[PDB]
Design a protein around this ligand. Structure first.
Ligand SMILES: OC[C@H]1O[C@@](CO)(O[C@H]2O[C@H](CO)[C@@H](O)[C@H](O)[C@H]2O)[C@@H](O)[C@@H]1O
Ligand code: CL
Ligand code: CL
Ligand code: CL
Ligand code: CL
Ligand code: CL
Ligand code: CL
Ligand code: CL
Ligand code: CL
Lengths: 159, 175
């Protein structure tokens, strides 16, 4: 369903834009082909409609839902305050803490796309397949989410 | 099921709803966080659901608390609970015109009273001024109730009494 996927992307972009300006730390993992059921069950179940508003309310500091991962599965916010594994990568910059290391860790054992907001700088990062793309612009964020979450790769790969 | 193995599914969902309300209101009350939670019963509240932001979410004390954090997108209005979901947040409810409602009470109390006049909803209010917990039902206000009185009214009004042995067997619902 192309329509739900474009809404998902917009919801991620607007919520992370708001948190970034406020240096609110956040972690959103979007499940793809590999199952994330065991990580979903570690958290508080929501099974909620996706909206930028609900994503922002989830991550407000010192609230019951903020301390852990949001996992998006199908067309729902499946859970909040979920556990994710921590990467032991030594290549990760020293100013990045356990949130970035959790995002990297999940990307190492799933094909999920994970978006991170830094509580120190408000920079936005992405992880995929054991790798981190640090401090992306608004345009780069949009381009990678469109490519990785909207199925309609139809054109020749070179482009 | 997910909730537990005792009694019927409906019973467990209703006891979880009650506990979710009690825990969330206790947390908000000590922080003087304003809150307004309306539980639909036999009366449709679909039109008020449509005024809010849709959530269609599993009920938890945690989600109720996060919804009402001040100065957030979801806090400004009513949560409406319908079936076994948090249907919407930041919904508009009608205001009561009653002059019998104390002027010391704010817009949340007047919205809670207003909905209770045209539905058989149970509505819970946390006052941002006093931290008191209030309840409305059928045009009446129960003001600044104790934890014990809150539990007693929620049990009576929100838990369907069901037969004992019949409750342990799950019925087929097409799945
Ligand atoms: O607990 C409130 C919740 O229960 C439901 C059924 O899931 O309502 C049923 O039980 C109520 C209280 O015992 C009754 O008022 C009602 O008539 C009955 O449908 C939900 O509709 C309600 O939100
Ligand atoms: Cl469409
Ligand atoms: Cl951080
Ligand atoms: Cl950064
Ligand atoms: Cl259950
Ligand atoms: Cl508390
Ligand atoms: Cl108030
Ligand atoms: Cl008390
Ligand atoms: Cl008491």
């Amino acid at each position: 369903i192309e329509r739900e996927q474009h809404h998902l992307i917009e919801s991620i972009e607007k919520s992370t834009q708001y948190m970034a300006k406020r240096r609110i730390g956040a972690l959103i993992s979007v499940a793809r082909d590999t199952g994330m059921d065991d990580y979903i069950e570690t958290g508080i179940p929501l099974n909620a409609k996706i909206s930028s508003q609900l994503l922002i309310n989830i991550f407000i500091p010192n609230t019951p839902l903020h301390d852990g991962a949001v996992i998006i599965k199908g067309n729902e916010i499946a859970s909040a305050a979920s556990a994710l594994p921590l990467s032991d990568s030594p290549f990760l910059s020293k100013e990045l803490g356990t949130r970035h290391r959790a995002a990297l860790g999940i990307s190492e054992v799933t094909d999920s796309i994970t978006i991170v907001v830094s509580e120190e700088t408000g920079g936005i990062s992405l992880t995929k397949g054991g790798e981190l793309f640090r401090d992306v612009s608004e345009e780069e964020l949009h381009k990678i989410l469109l490519k990785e979450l909207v199925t309609v790769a139809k054109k020749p790969s070179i482009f």
